[PDB]
Structure 1
Amino acid sequence: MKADAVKIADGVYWVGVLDWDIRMYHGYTLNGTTYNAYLVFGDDKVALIDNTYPGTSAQMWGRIKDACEKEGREFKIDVIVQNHVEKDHSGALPEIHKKFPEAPIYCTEVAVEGLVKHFPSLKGAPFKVVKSLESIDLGGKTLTFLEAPLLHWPDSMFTLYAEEGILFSNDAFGQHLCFTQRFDHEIPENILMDANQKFYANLITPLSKLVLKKFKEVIELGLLEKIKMIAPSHGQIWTDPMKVIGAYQDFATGKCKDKVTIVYDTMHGSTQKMAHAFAEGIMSEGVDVKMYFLHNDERSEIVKDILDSKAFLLGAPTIYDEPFPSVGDLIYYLKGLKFNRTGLKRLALAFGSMGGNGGGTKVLAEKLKECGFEVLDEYELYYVPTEDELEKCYNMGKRLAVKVKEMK
């Protein structure tokens, strides 16, 4: 395939892959994404930083050939860097190693066993284990490695091109966006920061304390102000790195809007009527609302909006003494994401309709507490809400919205 590389600095190219057509990626909804790989031309050695998903390398190889041609160099890679073992960034490593078998593969210690377990043909490949602050010289360009375990996997690391302050952060600071434009400043800010928020919410939330720890280490090494560009493994390249670092600082410390996310499911529409009545009460106080119906909507957008919501409402009818089962998916996901690690226990209310002994709302309230929410109340009613019962939902939403606006 013929495909052009994109220069991001002198002798540095994006040689990634545009996954135009993907719409679901591990339960994360998106309108395509990219697998960003980078090619650094030192005077002596050419290094490839990360690669792409298995079967998607046609664009990558085309862009690598284009970059070598633009540099007046032979089609050759001398050094391979693997920041992360997950196959969306390591999937072409078997073919890169087969093509360039003498190129060493720089990665963390735990990455070696992980990569060989993913790709058995790499057994006996020239792996070179790296540690934080160790560097390699490409000839006028230096790559410095920085271990970042559990940001987001135990094998994860960042690679810094020291002379120009370009941080190849792999997943950290990435966003699932697929545009012809490669840089942060070339697309609308709302699209960029909404995709960044969704990426943090789904991938970084349980790591919020480690984010702040990594930031303290990066500032104590005096290297924060040296970062001129962040080139992540998905989406746009940050020419304004402090914009995304600032967004991460806000998400990791529980900075939220005066906003409530409401999620519900229904069989006969009664829980839906309750959800809409809670929203009316919240809106009467000028507090924003995002409304999700689990029949149609899915977990990755829901958790994006919870991330900057001060409160979360969850509603479902009772079926055989349990809440309607679709909530189980979201609850299992919230149990993993651990929103309390942002330093904020978001307020919550459980609600629902029932037709006998009930009990679904009590289960929801207990699960919301396990997920780190501050459950203020619960409201369960019999079949179709009356006018007085919808006014109670409105009043509960109104009183919640007052508490939301009072919250620091």
Structure 2
Amino acid sequence: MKAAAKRISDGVYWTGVLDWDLRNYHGYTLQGTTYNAYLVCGDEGVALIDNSYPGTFDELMARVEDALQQVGMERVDYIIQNHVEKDHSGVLVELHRRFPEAPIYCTEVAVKGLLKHYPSLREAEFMTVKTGDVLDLGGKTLTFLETPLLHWPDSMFTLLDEDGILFSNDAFGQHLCCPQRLDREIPEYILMDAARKFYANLITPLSKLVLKKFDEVKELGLLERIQMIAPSHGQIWTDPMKIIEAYTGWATGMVDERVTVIYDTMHGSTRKMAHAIAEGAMSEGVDVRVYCLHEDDRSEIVKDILESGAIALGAPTIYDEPYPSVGDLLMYLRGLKFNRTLTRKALVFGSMGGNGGATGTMKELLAEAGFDVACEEEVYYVPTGDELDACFEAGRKLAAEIR
């Protein structure tokens, strides 16, 4: 197969897979992604860091072969698995068959997870690693750093300290599929919006552990030595402090003045309320976003929630419950635990035809999910002018609190 590797540093090559076609997975929408794998070539040893999704072996191997031919070397001597997730371990079996002599370097928890995914690796050679362990490739050394982060219990960072490259698994990732391999070769808006979305959807509940990981990195004296961050998806950071600083802001609740308004409706009354609420919020000079659960994906909604000090959630009542689509977002938000960054304000609202129940339900669930539920607007059927004014004031007040 003809597929080229990309030299990223001396004896270090990107040898990953471009997934142009993926649009939706893990609960998340995207316009394609990459599975970044890296070939590190020392004086005496060659290490491959991570691999790719099942069925992508030929492409990954073509790039590994090209890299090797570029440096004048021939085998992979070590296979490194910073995580067990199938889009980074999906061709491990094929890799093991191709390089039978290569030990697999990973954490002890990764061994379990890898063997449960791929039982035929019962026969393979593993080298479990712990924080501070080293693999010497001759003139280059890889140091391992466990990053269990509660819910990524197999994960680790690999540090190449002579190039100052951190291979960070999914941390600092973004779902982007570009011909350009580097952060600086694409528009900054695109780069940061994808990085933002990845944080909101994947790192939010881990925010405390991420901050703790940063302090440990700083304590081992590895941070003054980051020249580059090579994540498992998307662009390589040649400006690692840009993404570290953004992450620090996201983990600590640094937001601009923004209110995200989210609703569903059947007959339009909750929609009118949502517009009046957004109108009020706008009058206070804050940024406003409006999403409709009928149309909009949860992963885009939470990207904006990350950057918002306040939200408004509205749905009509359907047999004592909110419209069922809010059950999807509320469950997601209960997993994301935004209170770990900042306990954002929440206004709940909706139309109803008799006994209601949706707004108190949403209050219950928003509070459990770590929002500070500020108040409510509940309307019988179609709102009147006065009721719409009341909606405008609710949004104005909500915007005023987060200024």
Is TM (by shorter chain) over 0.5?
A: yes
TM-score, with structure 1 as normaliser: 0.98
Query: Does the 8 Å CA contact 2:47/2:77 hold for their aligned counterparts?
Result: yes
Query: Does the 8 Å CA contact 2:12/2:38 hold for their aligned counterparts?
Result: yes
**4+ runs deviating over 4 angstroms:** none
Q: In the alignment, what sits opposite 1:367?
A: 365
1:40-89 per-residue CA deviation (whole Å, 9 max, x = no partner) reads 11111111000000012222111011111111222x21100000000010
TM-score, with structure 2 as normaliser: 0.99
Q: In the alignment, what sits opposite 2:381?
A: 383
Q: In the alignment, what sits opposite 2:126?
A: 127
1:196-243 per-residue CA deviation (whole Å, 9 max, x = no partner) reads 110000000000000110011111112211110000000000000000
- Inter-partner Cα distance in structure 2 for 1:153 and 1:99: 28
Q: In the alignment, what sits opposite 1:154?
A: 153
- Inter-partner Cα distance in structure 1 for 2:232 and 2:353: 50
Structure 2 residue 262 is matched with structure 1 residue 263? yes
Q: In the alignment, what sits opposite 2:182?
A: 183
- Inter-partner Cα distance in structure 1 for 2:184 and 2:150: 25
Q: In the alignment, what sits opposite 1:204?
A: 203
1:345-391 per-residue CA deviation (whole Å, 9 max, x = no partner) reads 10001100000111111111111111110111011101111111111
Query: Does the 8 Å CA contact 1:152/1:172 hold for their aligned counterparts?
Result: no
Where does 1:1-400 land on structure 2 (aligned, <5 Å)? 1-74=1-74, 76-150=75-149, 153-342=152-341, 344-400=342-398
SS class of match (2:347): strand
1:21-48 per-residue CA deviation (whole Å, 9 max, x = no partner) reads 1111222100000000000111111110
1:230-263 per-residue CA deviation (whole Å, 9 max, x = no partner) reads 0000000000000000011000001011001111
| Letter of the structure 2 residue corresponding to residue 167 of structure 1 | L
| Letter of the structure 2 residue corresponding to residue 182 of structure 1 | R
| Letter of the structure 1 residue corresponding to residue 228 of structure 2 | M
1:164-196 per-residue CA deviation (whole Å, 9 max, x = no partner) reads 110000100000000001001111111111111
1:81-124 per-residue CA deviation (whole Å, 9 max, x = no partner) reads 00000001000100000111110000000100100000111112
- Inter-partner Cα distance in structure 1 for 2:402 and 2:105: 48
| Letter of the structure 2 residue corresponding to residue 294 of structure 1 | L
- Inter-partner Cα distance in structure 2 for 1:195 and 1:249: 16
| Letter of the structure 1 residue corresponding to residue 70 of structure 2 | K
SS class of match (1:144): strand
SS class of match (1:276): helix
- Inter-partner Cα distance in structure 2 for 1:85 and 1:169: 14
- Percentage of matched positions with identical amino acids: 71
Query: Does the 8 Å CA contact 1:165/1:226 hold for their aligned counterparts?
Result: yes
- Inter-partner Cα distance in structure 1 for 2:303 and 2:83: 24
| 1:151 Cα offset (Å) | 6.9
Query: Does the 8 Å CA contact 2:149/2:210 hold for their aligned counterparts?
Result: no
- Inter-partner Cα distance in structure 1 for 2:57 and 2:259: 42
Query: Does the 8 Å CA contact 2:284/2:400 hold for their aligned counterparts?
Result: yes
What 5-or-longer segments of structure 2 have no aligned partner? none
Query: Does the 8 Å CA contact 1:37/1:233 hold for their aligned counterparts?
Result: yes
Query: Does the 8 Å CA contact 1:152/1:171 hold for their aligned counterparts?
Result: no
| 1:152 Cα offset (Å) | 5.3
- Inter-partner Cα distance in structure 2 for 1:335 and 1:151: 16
SS class of match (2:162): helix
| 1:10 Cα offset (Å) | 0.5
- Inter-partner Cα distance in structure 2 for 1:190 and 1:294: 25
- Inter-partner Cα distance in structure 2 for 1:42 and 1:238: 22
| 1:295 Cα offset (Å) | 0.5
- Inter-partner Cα distance in structure 2 for 1:137 and 1:397: 59
- Inter-partner Cα distance in structure 2 for 1:239 and 1:146: 21
- Inter-partner Cα distance in structure 1 for 2:273 and 2:79: 56
- Inter-partner Cα distance in structure 2 for 1:198 and 1:326: 21
In the comparison of the two structures, how many residue pairs are matched? 403
- Inter-partner Cα distance in structure 1 for 2:58 and 2:197: 29
| Letter of the structure 1 residue corresponding to residue 102 of structure 2 | A
- Inter-partner Cα distance in structure 1 for 2:78 and 2:394: 61
Query: Does the 8 Å CA contact 1:151/1:204 hold for their aligned counterparts?
Result: no
Query: Does the 8 Å CA contact 1:37/1:48 hold for their aligned counterparts?
Result: yes
RMSD: 0.8
- Inter-partner Cα distance in structure 2 for 1:245 and 1:151: 20
Query: Does the 8 Å CA contact 1:322/1:359 hold for their aligned counterparts?
Result: yes
